[PDB]
Amino acid sequence: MNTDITALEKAQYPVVDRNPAFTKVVGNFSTLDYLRFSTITGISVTVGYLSGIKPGIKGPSMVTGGLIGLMGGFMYAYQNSAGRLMGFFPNDGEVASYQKR
Template identity: 35%
Template sequence: MTTDASLPNRAIKQLDTPYPVVDADPHFSRVVRSFRGSDYAAMAGATAAFPSAIYLMEMFDPTRPKRGLGSALRLSTFLGLCGGFLYAYQRSSFRFWGWRENEVEQAAHQAAVDAGIKPPGTDPSKSDLTPYMQGVAHRNSAFSQLKFSTLPWFNLVDHPYHASSPSDNSSSSSQE
């Protein structure tokens, strides 16, 4: 059984990515703050596509609802907005993981490190959770952006598991 003191030193699996990893498990606020214009465009496109598809289907195969299409279009707009947000969040997370081009995120991360500012979600001293529970939160949220179709899950916990390079975990191999 491991002790609480050894948990922050656990290794984070390193993946071969085409771009440098900025954060292996980015905090929700950090991901949303780094949305680009293309992410907002993708979100807007999904928001518009869902009710447009409902309207087109109604034109080609009418159901003639008694109250009209208003409520169905409002619901489909909301669902399109939710799906668009999850898609934009996933795109932004891919940049933090190094799966997509991430020069802007690298520059912002380096500027924060040079200024001595910890990015959101990376300061475990701000968390009310024990180190063990921080580890549980990390294990639940790591790569959860790949499972949005099953269960939308975000990292909302400040924890120390944010390896951005192999050197971040250099002391962890002796602890395991």
């Protein structure tokens, strides 16, 4: 399979890594990424609990909401971290860490 990461709209910030590996993107998670992750997961668990009370399955509903929130929050944090490493999002921290290591 031939691949090509090249985007239609070029990056407006310095490109620290054109096609960062999965584990590199995850290790690039910042405090703000974890805050987004945790907030999305917590809101999802809360919605699961509250919507589960009337059917009587608040626990399992919490688990289902938490799974949805975990997947969505991880995808959002990955989106942000990868976009920063690729230069699509403001990436002052990535540039600073890159100019030193």
